[PDB]
């Protein structure tokens, strides 16, 4: 569709289910190792994906603490704004 993907994970018990990182001297943090049948799974998050909103915040300029704050702070659920990196590109 035209809308990026808008994943909703409601936290379980071993917690969302993925890896979220980023690479060295850059910005951008994305998805990695994302759990069978976990609440990451069920909402559709892939490996590789880039995120680009936390709870309607965008947060493509902060760090890996920063973001990683933001969805621990929301504790009990999290609304994520995924893109396909391959696919788009901000300008
Ligand atoms: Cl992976
Ligand atoms: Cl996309």
Do not use: W
Not at 11 to 31: D, R, V
Not at 75 to 82: D, G, S
């Amino acid at each position: 569709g035209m809308l990026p993907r808008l994943c909703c994970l409601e936290k379980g018990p071993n917690g969302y289910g993925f890896h979220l990182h980023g690479e060295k001297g850059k910005l951008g943090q994305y998805i990695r190792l994302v759990e069978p049948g976990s609440p990451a799974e069920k909402a559709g998050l892939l490996a590789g994906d880039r995120l680009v909103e936390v709870n309607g915040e965008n947060v493509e300029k902060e760090t890996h603490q920063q973001v990683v704050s933001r969805i621990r702070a929301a504790l009990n659920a999290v609304r994520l704004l995924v893109v396909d990196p391959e696919q788009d590109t901000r300008l």
